Every structure is written in C-alpha cells, then in structure tokens.
Amino acid sequence: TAEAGITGTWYNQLGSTLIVTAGADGALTGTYESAVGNAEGSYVLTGRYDSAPATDGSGTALGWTVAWKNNYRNAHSASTWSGQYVGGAEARINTQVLTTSGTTEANAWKSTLVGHDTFTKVKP
C-alpha cells in the first residue's frame, strides 16, 4: 500500500532527512531536518497523500509543509514539497519545492524560491 511504502525515513540529494508517517486516511505527519539554509535541528512536518492511488504504474500524489520555526531558530519562512511517491526496489519521492519567506509588500516578488528535491530510502 501507499501507506506502507511512504512511512519511514527518507533522504534528499542535499543530505536532508525526512521522517514521515502516512496515516490510513491520507495524513502525513513527521519531522524534517534540513542540511541547508537557515535551519538547525528538526522541524514539524504535516501534509496529505492520495491513500488510494491508481494501480496502473502511476505514482502516488502527495505534498507536505514545513514552517522553519522550531526550538532552535525561526527563519520566518515555510517550504512546501509537491510530488509523487514511486514504489519498488529503488523507491523515490520526486518533488518540486516552494520556499516562501515573509517579506514586505515591496519585496514580495522575491519572496519565493523554487527547487526540486529527490528523496531515497538510503543516504546519497
């Protein structure tokens, strides 16, 4: 199942660590530790996934958010990852990620970064 495949620890191409539980209903809950940026320690993560994906070889759609405030630091920013889980022997979560920082109105045009993160079950 998608639930079974997604739950656990994942690692992106930058050295960041995702620990997530996929609930029976569609919930994603866990923590995120970033190897980059104004970030230290782990941050709360919450999101959603399709709990009944197609069975035709298509991936499982999902997304999650981390606000970059925890017991260590507050970066006044939040990231969202949107993507799909791909199961099997070389399982992946392939994502694109938006990172929005709080800005003044004048600076809103430069508030949001776009990037792409690929997550694997073993460290890169």
From Swiss-Prot:
This is Streptavidin. The chain holds residues 37 to 159 of 183 of the full protein. Homotetramer. One of its GO terms (cellular component) is extracellular region. The lineage of its organism: Bacteria, Bacillati, Actinomycetota, Actinomycetes, Kitasatosporales. Residues 2-124 form the Avidin-like domain. The keyword Transcription does not apply. A motif (Cell attachment site) lies at residues 48-50. It is found in: Secreted. GO terms for molecular function: biotin binding. Belongs to the avidin/streptavidin family. Biotin binds at residues 32, 43, 81, 97, 109. Keywords: Biotin, Secreted, Signal. The biological function of streptavidin is not known. Forms a strong non-covalent specific complex with biotin (one molecule of biotin per subunit of streptavidin).
